[PDB]
Amino acid sequence: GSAPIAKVTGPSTGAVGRNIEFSGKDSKDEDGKIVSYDWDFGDGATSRGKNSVHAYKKAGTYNVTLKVTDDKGATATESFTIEIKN
């Protein structure tokens, strides 16, 4: 369709205080070209950029979202759940 497709690549698990890498590299668009990647790590924190990194302060289950926007201004968001342990 006209929306881009957002995809979040990352690990299913991680540890408190460790940098976790997330990537939007497999996002794609039939009807435009993606220009921006906005991340929400589920603990209040955000980042920008195709490849982003976050460390969680506490153990828990977090829903990471990625919103991609394309050159025509069309958006899509996708979610990824990560379990963080001590």
Numbering used by the authors: 685 to 770
Please give me the paper's original passages concerning this structure.
The collagenases consist of a collagenase module (s1), a variable number of polycystic kidney disease-like (PKD-like) domains (s2a and s2b in ColH and s2 in ColG) and a variable number of collagen-binding domains (s3 in ColH and s3a and s3b in ColG). The X-ray crystal structures of Ca2+-bound holo s2a (space group C2), Ca2+-free apo s2a (space group P61), Ca2+-bound holo s2b (space group P21) and two new forms of N-terminally truncated wild-type apo s2 (space groups P21 and P212121) are reported for the first time. Comparison of crystal structures of ColG s2 with crystal structures of ColH s2a and s2b suggests that despite common tertiary folds, PKD-like domains can be grouped into two subsets.
All four molecules are virtually identical to each other (r.m.s.d. of <0.5 Å). The last residue is either 770 or 771. In apo s2, intermolecular antiparallel β-sheet interactions involving β-strand A could suppress dynamics of the region. In contrast, the subset containing s2 is likely to be different; the lack of surface aromatic residues on s2 suggests that the domain is less directly involved in interactions with collagen.
